[PDB]
Paper text:
Aurora‐A is a Ser/Thr protein kinase that regulates mitotic entry and mitotic spindle assembly (Nikonova et al, 2013) through phosphorylation of many substrates. These include [name], a member of the transforming acidic coiled‐coil family of proteins, which have conserved functions in microtubule dynamics. Like many of its other binding partners, such as TPX2, I‐2, HEF1, and N‐Myc, [name] is an Aurora‐A activator (Nikonova et al, 2013; Richards et al, 2016). [name] binds Aurora‐A through a region 30aa N‐terminal to the S558 phosphorylation site, centred on a critical phenylalanine residue, F525 (Burgess et al, 2015).
Crystals of TACC3N‐ACID bound to an Aurora‐A 122–403 C290A, C393A, D274N mutant (Aurora‐AM3KD) diffracted to 2.0 Å resolution. Residues 126–280 and 290–392 of Aurora‐AM3KD were included in the final model, with the part of the activation loop being disordered consistent with its unphosphorylated state (Cheetham et al, 2002; Burgess et al, 2016). TACC3N‐ACID mostly adopts an extended conformation but with two short regions of secondary structure: a 310‐helix formed by 528–530, and an α‐helix by 546–555 (αTR). Due to crystal packing, each molecule of TACC3N‐ACID contacts three molecules of Aurora‐AM3KD. These contacts cover the entire length of TACC3N‐ACID, which allowed it to be fully resolved, and involved three distinct sites on the surface of Aurora‐AM3KD (labelled as sites 1–3). The interaction at site 1 involves residues 523–535 of TACC3N‐ACID binding to the surface of the β‐sheet in the Aurora‐A N‐lobe contacting β‐strands β1–β3 and β5 and adopting an extended conformation, with the exception of a short 310‐helix at aa527–532. The total surface area buried in this interface is ~950 Å2, and the key contributions are made by [name] residues F525, L532, P528, and Aurora‐A residues I135 and R151. The F525 side chain is inserted into a pocket formed by the side chains of R151, I158, L149, E134, and main chains of G136 and A150, of Aurora‐A. The interface also involves an intermolecular salt bridge between E523 of [name] and R137 of Aurora‐A and a H‐bond between the main chain oxygen of [name] R526 and the main chain amine of Aurora‐A I135. In the complex with TACC3N‐ACID, Aurora‐AM3KD is in an inactive conformation in which the αC‐helix is distorted and K162 and E181 are separated and unable to form a salt bridge. Based upon NMR and biochemical data, we conclude that the interaction of [name] in solution is that observed at site 1 in the crystal structure and that this site contributes to the activation of Aurora‐A by [name].
Author numbering:
A (entry chain B): 522 to 563
B (entry chain A): 126 to 280, 290 to 392
Write the structure that this text describes.
């Protein structure tokens, strides 16, 4: 029930708080999941 | 073969402090669950405690006892020190005492039995460990005591657990641990330590003169043990084997059952 991650994803996340802030991330990822990439014709 | 950060995956934080962080963690190959204490080199150097740290981890790494938190190993990278520790899942005795206010005689005798056992083992290795305050005692999964302030922490009182010979600035030895055990036994049963006072000056007085009183609910067996432990003269305090033989301890302690 307890989750574990690679140390690179955990250590120093408190320190890199400013770099972990990116406007529009969750909205963009959601709409990325829902959009299709059409086959490259011609 | 050396320990490496690559050997581990890291879970939720268990505590944070100026010196670093403690995490729930897991060794990748075995999936063995443990705790990883992570210390900032910058803060250690800034505090000048690098020598002291090495000494403490060296000491803990050789203690192997069911009621002492194991240190399985240690390593470092460019900016951090990593201590691989036994995980104790049920929190501190401090918190349990908050929740319950006071412990009954069976819980107290049982805790004191586990501590005397751990301390006897420590003394057999010429190790003195006076600080056994409730906040330094973790609980294992079976509710057994784990002395948890070996190694290094991420972080009118405190004097509360100091013996007369220490506050008077005299030579002290392993018998300071017997005084601690008395203070702790009292605090377990009463809910506060026996020499508590408002000022530094007045707490010094009470300890130095060994002045304290029992609530009327404290039984004769308990009073007898605590009074033997809180003797001004260290050589008049019992040996730990004598604590483990005390009638009040033997009658009220328990081992696991259904
Ligand atoms: N091995 C461990 N297992 C579970 N909890 C731990 C462990 N080590 C430390 N903790 C908890 O993490 C916090 C920080 O502990 P520590 O670095 O020893 O400083 P403290 O003096 O506050 O205990 C405390 O709440 C402590 O109880």
């Amino acid at each position: 029930e307890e989750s574990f991650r690679d140390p690179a994803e955990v250590l120093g996340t408190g320190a890199e708080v400013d770099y972990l802030e990116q406007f529009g991330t969750s909205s963009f990822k959601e709409s990325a999941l829902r959009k299709q990439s059409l086959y490259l014709k011609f | 073969r050396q320990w490496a950060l690559e050997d581990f995956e890291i879970g939720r934080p268990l505590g944070k402090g100026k010196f670093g962080n403690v995490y729930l963690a897991r060794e990748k190959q075995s999936k063995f669950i443990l705790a990883l204490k992570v210390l900032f080199k910058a803060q250690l150097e800034k505090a000048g405690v690098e020598h002291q740290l090495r000494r403490e981890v060296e000491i803990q790494s050789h203690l192997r006892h069911p009621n002492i938190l194991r240190l399985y190993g240690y390593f470092h990278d460019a900016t951090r020190v990593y201590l691989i520790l036994e995980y104790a899942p049920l929190g501190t005795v401090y918190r349990e005492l908050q929740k319950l206010s006071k412990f009954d005689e069976q819980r107290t005798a049982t805790y004191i039995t586990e501590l005397a056992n751990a301390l006897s083992y420590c003394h057999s290795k010429r190790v003195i460990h006076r600080d056994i305050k409730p906040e330094n005692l973790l609980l294992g999964s079976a509710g057994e005591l784990k002395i948890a302030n070996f190694g290094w922490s991420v972080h009118a009182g405190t004097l509360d657990y100091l013996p007369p010979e220490m506050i008077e600035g005299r030579m002290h030895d392993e018998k300071v641990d017997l005084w601690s055990l008395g203070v702790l036994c009292y605090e377990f049963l009463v809910g506060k330590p026996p020499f508590e006072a408002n000022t530094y000056q007045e707490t010094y007085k009470r300890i130095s003169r060994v002045e304290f009183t029992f609530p009327d609910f404290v039984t004769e067996g308990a009073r007898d043990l605590i009074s033997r432990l809180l003797k001004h003269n260290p050589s008049q305090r019992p040996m730990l084997r004598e604590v483990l033989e005390h009638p009040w301890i033997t009658a009220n302690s328990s081992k696991p059952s259904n």
